Structures are given as structure tokens and as C-alpha cells.
Design a protein around this ligand. Structure first.
Ligand SMILES: Nc1nc(CCc2ccccc2)cc(=O)[nH]1
Length: 330
């Protein structure tokens, strides 16, 4: 089997991407944030505290003839950015772009943190990291991709995120028309439960390539590109007037600047992130100070190849016996 679904930026800055998902019988379609950096499929629901729901589409398990409460099971997650959610668990039928899993764990939110309430565009998360990170207790549950994998034509999914435009998640096949040149595959460690790999280095604009190992994660659920302070300083030094602001919480730059590109290495291959991808717009409405899309990973403890990086590539999440990641230009 295979599946294919379009993924859409939630706003004009590509702050996150949503993908429609069918849950239950009859289908209830929710727009979920496909997150290769976490491993819970959770949704806003009929059970979510009423004051914590503000425009999201909710899953109502009582209206699904295939929903079954998973006895005694609860979940609670806290993300890298400080947001959180928790609740109980059903198993139900879940489909993505024509691909169906029966008995998928659907984690129904009883509580969500304020950032989720405040964003009406995201109805929940669909985790695509390794199932070892799933938070369901006392019996850990499998991700959508883990459940689907055996049935897929090939045990893979791909992320093709758009810059200011729709993109695609495919399951079970590689669309050879969706990228240019070849796909370069690179080793993955699953020891932290992430798609963790090692970049071979970087370049800033037309500058020469610096060969240096950067360990990090391919994370569709993180918006920005988080890299070591030395690398991030080298980037922003090329932007006149750019400064790290402790009050804002990162590098900001004059909105009138034209930003240089940033290149990262995958083996001998190179993925080029155009300068415009790094512009996250005014820090507050009407400001002429803009927020940078490349930020220091210092004190978050891990480098993160988030959407800023991934949207410059066609990305293969290869779930073979020994997982690997592939990157191509596009
Ligand atoms: N990998 C990853 N996932 C999340 C998911 C939660 C989320 C979703 C949209 C906006 C804000 C928070 C948060 C995070 O920091 N990293």
C-alpha cells in the first residue's frame, strides 16, 4: 500500500505545516501537525476542557463506531518549546491520503497548554519519530508509521515541505519526479528516539564549505534551524546589523536586509537553503526588526534541522531494519 497527502503552511511565515487526517467511522477529518520529532498522535477532542478549545476541529470518539477506549491508558507530553498536552486514549481507524491503519492509538486531549488553544489551525499532532518516545502509560503505543510500515510497498515516508506553498507527505514510495539529481543517504542513530544524523558541514552564502561534524535531528515539527553557536554566529555576521537579542530570545536583523543562503552537507552532497527561507518577519507587528530562522542550539541541548532546513530538500525517512535518512535537492 501507499498514501499521499498534501501538507500546507499554517500561516504566511511557514510557522508549521498541517496535513488532513481521517479519524474514525464515519471519518472525522482533523488537520494534524506531522512531527518527525515526537511519537504521539494526539487530537483536540470532545473531552478537551471547553475553555481550552478556541476554533480547532475536535475528534468525538462517542460518534465513531470503531473507537474503543483503551482501558487505563493515559498520556502526557511536554515538547521542546515548553508546550504540553495530556489525556486518555482510544484506538480507532486512521487514514492519511489513502493509507489506512486500524487500531491506531488516538490520544484524546483532556488538557492542552495555552499555545495550542491560541492556535486554531492545528487540531493535533501526528508523531513520526520512533515509537520508543511514545508517552502512553502504562502500555506504550505505536506511531502511525510503525503500524503502517509492514503493509507499505517500501518501509519509508518522505517529506517535501514547501516554502510559502503546499507540499507533500508520501508513505510507502519515493516519487522520483519530486527532486533533482540523486538522493544521498546518511546514517541514523535512534538512541534518543529521533531521526538523528550527522551533517558533514556548512557554508554561508557564496563562502567556502566548512567540513565539520554537526550531529542533529531531522524534525518536521520544529520551525527553525538550530545549530551550534559558532555556526550561527558565522551566519549572522554576514548580515549587516544582525544581533543576538536576549530580550527577543535570538538573532534579529533589519527587515530591509537581503539574507545570504545557508548550505548544509549530507555526505558529499550539499543542500542550499535560500536566504529568503531564513526570514521570519517582524518581531512584533509593525516592527522593522525581523526574526532570524537560524538560531543557536545552545541550552536546548541538541541541533535541530527543522522546517527551515528540511523545506529546502526532498527528505526520505527510511524505516528499513537499519533506518537511514536521504536528502535530495528539489
Ligand atoms: N518536534 C517538535 N514538536 C513540537 C510539537 C508541539 C507544537 C506544534 C506546533 C506549534 C508549537 C508546538 C514542538 C517542538 O518544540 N518540537
Amino acid at each position: 500500500s501507499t498514501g499521499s497527502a498534501t501538507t500546507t503552511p499554517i500561516d504566511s511565515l511557514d510557522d508549521a505545516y498541517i496535513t488532513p487526517v481521517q479519524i474514525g467511522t464515519p471519518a472525522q477529518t482533523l488537520n494534524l501537525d506531522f512531527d518527525t520529532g515526537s511519537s504521539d498522535l494526539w487530537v483536540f477532542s470532545s473531552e478537551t476542557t471547553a475553555s481550552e478549545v478556541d476554533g480547532q476541529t475536535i475528534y468525538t470518539p462517542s460518534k465513531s463506531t470503531t473507537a474503543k477506549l483503551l482501558s487505563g491508558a493515559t498520556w502526557s507530553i511536554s515538547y521542546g518549546d515548553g508546550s504540553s498536552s495530556s489525556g486518555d486514549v482510544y484506538t480507532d481507524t486512521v487514514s492519511v491520503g489513502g493509507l489506512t491503519v486500524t487500531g491506531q492509538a488516538v490520544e484524546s486531549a483532556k488538557k492542552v497548554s495555552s499555545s495550542f488553544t491560541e492556535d486554531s489551525t492545528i487540531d493535533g499532532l501526528l508523531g513520526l519519530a520512533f515509537s520508543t518516545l511514545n508517552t502512553v502509560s502504562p502500555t506504550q503505543q505505536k506511531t502511525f508509521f510503525d503500524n503502517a510500515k509492514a503493509s507499505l510497498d517500501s518501509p519509508v515516508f518522505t517529506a517535501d515541505l514547501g516554502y510559502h506553498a503546499p507540499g507533500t507527505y508520501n508513505f510507502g514510495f519515493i516519487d522520483t519526479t519530486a527532486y533533482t539529481g540523486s538522493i544521498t543517504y546518511t546514517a541514523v542513530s535512534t538512541k534518543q528516539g529521533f531521526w538523528e544524523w550527522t551533517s558533514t558541514g556548512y557554508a554561508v552564502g557564496s563562502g567556502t564549505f566548512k567540513s565539520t561534524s554537526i550531529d542533529g535531528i531531522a524534525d518536521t515539527g520544529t520551525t527553525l534551524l538550530y545549530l551550534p553557536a559558532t555556526v550561527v554566529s558565522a551566519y549572522w555576521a554576514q548580515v549587516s546589523g544582525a544581533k543576538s537579542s536576549s530580550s527577543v530570545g535570538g538573532y534579529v536583523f533589519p527587515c530591509s536586509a537581503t539574507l545570504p543562503s545557508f548550505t548544509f552537507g549530507v555526505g558529499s552532497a550539499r543542500i542550499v537553503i535560500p536566504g529568503d527561507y531564513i526570514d521570519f518577519g517582524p518581531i512584533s507587528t509593525g516592527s522593522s526588526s525581523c526574526f532570524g530562522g537560524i538560531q543557536s542550539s545552545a541550552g536546548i541541548g541538541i541541533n535541530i534541522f527543522g522546517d527551515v532546513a528540511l523545506k529546502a530538500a526532498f527528505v526520505v525517512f527510511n524505516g528499513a531494519t537499519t533506518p537511514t535518512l536521504g536528502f535530495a535537492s528539489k
